[PDB]
Amino acid sequence: EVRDATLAHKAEALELQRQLRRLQTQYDLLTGQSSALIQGRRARVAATSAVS
């Protein structure tokens, strides 16, 4: 009866931490992996101008 007054906030509680851990695996983990191929673009077009 009264736990519904309290279990209600539990649903949103697990919602934001589930976001937060989804956020947590993406704060400093995006820059760790999304820049893996950034190094290529320096030489990925140097050879393009080389055939000219």
């Binding site: 820059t31 820049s35 191929l37 290529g40 030489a43 990925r44 050879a47 393009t48």
Partner: protein
């Protein structure tokens, strides 16, 4: 933090797949140079004066 840009991928197809068969173009360049060569062929012994 969307700092990935797949333009490298667009150039990954471009960067060095040309060299993996670098000699396809030289066969055609031989064909383009063939008219230069065949003109040189016909300008060899008597047309050497040309």
């Amino acid at each position: 933090r969307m700092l990935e840009v797949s333009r490298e991928e667009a150039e990954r197809k471009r960067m060095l797949d040309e060299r993996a068969n670098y000699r396809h173009k030289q066969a055609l360049l031989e064909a383009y140079d063939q008219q230069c060569d065949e003109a040189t062929r016909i300008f060899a012994e008597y047309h050497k004066r040309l």
